[PDB]
Symmetry: C3
Subunit: 275 residues, 3 copies
């Protein structure tokens, strides 16, 4: 369970479909789009050719943060990288390992907790596409990265989580001891503060400290604005046990209005104390 060195040329098909009640979403199979979009994982140095079809009645696009891409895979109307209704296009994202340039300076790699979103619906910033659900997660791993038993994606989109109605979660389950991975993405108009009862993480790339020499901060509350993305890995219930562990936006009115879910950590027998 560690991430290998990348350098595969991988391929996938992505569709932008309309969903029930105003929503739109990406998906890897027509008829099966989802909010948030399907998780895309790659290893540093991979290349991904995304074979896109807009199946809707309005232009759409696909725009990625942090990964490498030429101006033709930008995903913006300004560059004519959008997709007409019914249209088709192939976006290419690349990645690079870190290393030294000819300069002798250090080039950082592509690894990170990133995301992809529309950039053309509603306005030329994607405002109404993001709002409708056109977003999702991409993880790019470094060699030797520790792999999880599970990855869950939490998006604070304006005043919702993953576009869901108020006080509907989502909830996620695990078993005590599971290495659980969280991808956290924020979108829209408002700043937020992500809080987890019972668990904490480092505020670096991996969410876990390099070792005793790692100056990274350890936190359980993280301010995030539109298009911030971060992620971490927590041992489920470490030092605290099983339970319905609340996670929420800690802005008080935001938590009060619905931006809450449960991290249901289970005992080996499958039962949750108090739930």
């Amino acid at each position: 369970g560690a991430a290998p060195a990348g350098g595969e040329v991988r391929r996938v098909t992505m569709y932008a479909e309309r969903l029930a009640g105003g929503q739109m979403g990406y998906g890897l199979e027509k008829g099966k789009a989802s909010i948030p979009g399907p998780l895309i994982e790659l290893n540093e140095g991979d290349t991904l050719h995304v074979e896109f079809e807009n199946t809707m009645d309005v232009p759409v696009s696909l725009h990625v943060h942090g990964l490498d891409y030429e101006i033709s895979s930008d995903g913006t109307k300004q560059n004519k990288s959008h997709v007409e209704p019914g249209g088709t296009r192939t976006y290419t994202w690349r990645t690079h390992e870190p290393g030294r340039r000819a300069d002798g300076t250090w080039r950082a790699g592509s690894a990170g907790y990133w995301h992809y979103h529309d950039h053309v619906v509603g306005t030329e910033a994607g405002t109404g596409g993001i709002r409708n659900g056109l977003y999702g997660p991409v993880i790019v791993r470094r060699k030797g990265d520790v792999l999880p038993d599970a990855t869950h994606t939490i998006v604070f989109n304006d005043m919702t989580i993953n576009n869901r109605p108020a006080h509907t979660g989502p909830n996620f389950e695990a078993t005590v001891g599971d290495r659980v991975e969280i991808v956290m993405i924020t979108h829209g108009e408002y700043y937020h503060t992500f809080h987890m009862h019972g668990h904490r993480w480092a505020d670096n790339r991996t969410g876990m400290l390099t070792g005793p020499d790692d100056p990274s901060q350890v936190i359980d509350n993280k301010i995030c604005g539109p298009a911030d993305s971060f992620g971490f890995q927590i041992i489920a219930g470490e030092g605290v046990g099983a339970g319905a562990w609340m996670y929420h936006c800690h802005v008080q009115s935001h938590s009060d209005m619905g931006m809450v879910g449960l991290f249901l950590v289970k005992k080996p027998d499958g039962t949750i104390p108090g739930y």
Copy 2:
């Protein structure tokens, strides 16, 4: 005052929740001595703390902590039936661990940090009314070896107030040039803020100070923060700048204009503050 020692001590303490004056509420180590911010709790990594907690109010209350290990019974939440009815008592158990290598070879991150506690049931099940009335306080958790300060001041940007004070009433904080002052900065409520100090800068890491010439941590003097963010640092009062009334404030302009200002009065050894009229 030296360096933080290794932890491991089981500690115990009594805590109450008292209505204060002006529709406020607060936390106290003794009855009739609730404060806003609540009493400063310091453990070292390893220590356990048993808070014999009692509610002296006519409405339920709770105690919820950030950053420290605790079981679900001391969650502080109506969902986990861990609140304290009017007139009730409860023992909240917090614990802390050291950092260490896991079985799988990964680094478990310590309990140390600048943390905080607050209510979770007054007003709404997130504790909005309780946080608003003053039911919050600081928790410092040291790691073995941490430099310890000459003094410690807690600054809580609560919505549009510092420590639930009225506009433009600071609070002010005194020190003397050369002192090692530790600031604990917590934020609560609805608004983002940006915390700024005149004359003084710190490292945006755990301890607010740099490991050494290899610590890559950012050296800031302005720091955005949102509800339930908690950080702190230590500075040398007047270092490289000398004595005087050194402003701190929220750098959100309308917040500084509408009261989120205070002075960090840095005295000469003789006790006087250049340029400043008490």
Copy 3:
């Protein structure tokens, strides 16, 4: 090309605050050449800078610096009798120090980094008025061995504007592929922002670049910020992504929609910009 040298030079400069067209205000090194942002001040750790200051306006003005070392008399505040009357002159001194180990064993953080200066007395004692009008400038303090860039651009999100500009006027900035471009990014006013660059990313640390494989700083391309935050980075133009009109915007959706967008214009070595067809 180059490297920051060690500091230690005393330097001097003239500064003028002047009214500009349309109730605006800005700073300048020469009279009549006032800009928004104000002129870029650059120093190396150790340097002292005396700034011969001229208030050409009819309204008092002040000069207030983040991050650097100054005594209360260069505080630039009404509080510390530190503002410049209409038609007044005044020398403001800024000092900077190298990082060094203190006599008490701790590490003292240096002055280096991406800082700024701004007015503190116009409109309010927070300088809310003069900051809105455009009285704010960038300050860069260099650590010895820092990589010096081919070009430096300053990007101030001032409330809902970029450099006080009208909506949807950039600024746009040009580079050639492979050029070492240093962004200075400041925020002011009332609102939080998220700064985003297409096709480019940087280290969230002091220099925006990682020092080596054991630098644990995050690699981001979207940075949240608020009034008086300042940061910076150097990127290699088009590295791994090539030439093009690379959009930089605030990613708060209503903020880019309403004009907070500009272009990073990266040219091929033949000077062309594929796709650019405004």
